[PDB]
Amino acid sequence: RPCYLVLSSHDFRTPRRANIHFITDQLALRGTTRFFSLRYSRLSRMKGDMRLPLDDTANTVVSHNGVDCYLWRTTVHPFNTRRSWLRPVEDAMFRWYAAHPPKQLLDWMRESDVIVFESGIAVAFIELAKRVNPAAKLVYRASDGLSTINVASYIEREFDRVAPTLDVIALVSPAMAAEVVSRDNVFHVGHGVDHNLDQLGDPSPYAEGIHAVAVGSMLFDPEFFVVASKAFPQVTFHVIGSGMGRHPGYGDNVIVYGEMKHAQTIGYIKHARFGIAPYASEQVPVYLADSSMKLLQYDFFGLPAVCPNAVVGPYKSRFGYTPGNADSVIAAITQALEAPRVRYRQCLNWSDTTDRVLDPRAYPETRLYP
Numbered sequence: 001r002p003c004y005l006v007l008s009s010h011d012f013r014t015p016r017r018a019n020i021h022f023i024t025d026q027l028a029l030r031g032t033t034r035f036f037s038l039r040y041s042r043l044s045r046m047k048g049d050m051r052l053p054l055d056d057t058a059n060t061v062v063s064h065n066g067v068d069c070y071l072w073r074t075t076v077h078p079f080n081t082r083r084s085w086l087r088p089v090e091d092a093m094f095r096w097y098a099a100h101p102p103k104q105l106l107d108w109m110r111e112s113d114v115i116v117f118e119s120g121i122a123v124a125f126i127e128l129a130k131r132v133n134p135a136a137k138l139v140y141r142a143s144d145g146l147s148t149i150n151v152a153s154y155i156e157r158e159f160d161r162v163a164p165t166l167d168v169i170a171l172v173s174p175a176m177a178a179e180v181v182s183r184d185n186v187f188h189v190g191h192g193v194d195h196n197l198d199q200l201g202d203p204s205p206y207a208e209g210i211h212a213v214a215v216g217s218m219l220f221d222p223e224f225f226v227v228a229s230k231a232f233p234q235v236t237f238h239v240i241g242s243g244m245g246r247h248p249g250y251g252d253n254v255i256v257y258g259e260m261k262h263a264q265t266i267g268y269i270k271h272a273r274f275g276i277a278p279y280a281s282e283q284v285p286v287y288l289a290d291s292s293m294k295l296l297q298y299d300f301f302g303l304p305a306v307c308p309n310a311v312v313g314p315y316k317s318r319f320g321y322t323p324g325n326a327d328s329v330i331a332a333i334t335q336a337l338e339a340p341r342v343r344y345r346q347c348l349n350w351s352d353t354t355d356r357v358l359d360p361r362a363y364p365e366t367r368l369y370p
């Protein structure tokens with residue numbers, strides 16, 4: 001119809017939408033779309049899974065925004081124990097998990113024309129997909145490098161083993177290609193933006209003054225704002241969906257917002273003087289410069305950005321600092337305040353991105369290899 005199946009450790013029903021959600025929306029426009037949510041177990045209650053609100057729907061198909069969703073809940077799920085001595089039990093758990101898919105996965109695999117595997121646990125199901133439906137186009141979407149999200153050795157090995165057999169390896173960033181053991185099926189397809197951004201970004205949420213925006217909780221560093229708010233009393237810092245509340249070190253020029261619907265964030269981005277990607281750590285992959293969603297959204301608007309030096313990457317209008325280093329935070333902001341707004345980055349919309357995720361060979365510029 002084309003029929004799509006997405007395998008991911010996300011669930012489609014989560015309010016926090018990631019890249020795979022935006023792709024899945026596009027898929028849902030193109031045909032019947034299923035989103036099979038992995039790495040969820042009774043153990044998932046021990047540490048604190050964001051999909052727990054969905055638990056009473058586990059192991060059943062739920063429709064959500066035109067997508068058939070299934071949160072697979074096993075008793076235990078396989079994971080990186082991060083103990084090299086536990087690797088043989090890890091491998092056993094992974095093999096077991098992969099050997100016991102629910103019939104619902106098998107049926108959906110069979111019904112699909114296209115199966116999209118997100119980087120991560122979905123790797124464990126690539127071989128299975130090929131056995132169930134060798135006609136399905138198998139599309140790996142590398143939202144992350146495997147080693148960065150620190151998958152179990154099993155997943156890395158399995159990915160290396162099956163990578164050549166994928167129809168598509170769609171890397172968010174060319175920087176991910178070094179750890180992908182395949183070539184001819186490896187493509188660059190960065191994150192999309194909504195087709196709509198410029199419309200969403202009006203009207204302005206801001207009154208007079210200088211407004212800085214940060215959106216998102218990834219590695220959120222409150223210390224950035226502690227320093228920045230003190231150093232720039234004339235700047236209002238709009239801290240949206242940081243995943244935490246009003247840190248006691250924030251000055252009064254910091255406005256802390258709860259989670260905001262993506263569409264509503266856009267005005268705050270479009271009309272800001274500069275944006276901030278306050279990653280607490282520089283222990284981040286080189287690709288984060290490319291794969292950062294907030295930074296892409298700032299870039300869409302040409303919004304000058306302040307971010308750690310490690311995610312400035314190959315980009316203009318990004319002013320790097322060292323986390324924990326007040327002077328560098330201050331120096332970066334001073335620069336971002338004076339930076340012109342220029343749309344340097346070409347940002348395909350989600351539909352055009354999905355086109356390329358699905359059929360990168362039709363868009364030969366996506367090729368990462370001869």
Ligand SMILES: O=c1ccn([C@@H]2O[C@H](COP(=O)(O)OP(=O)(O)O)[C@@H](O)[C@H]2O)c(=O)[nH]1
Pocket residue numbers: 017018215216217218219240241242258259260261262263265277291292293294295297
């Ligand atoms: O309240 C919020 C916070 C997050 N975001 C969006 O969530 C995405 C991912 O944020 P995150 O910090 O997790 O990742 P990053 O942008 O740094 O990759 C970005 O598109 C933000 O626009 C949002 O729409 N509302």
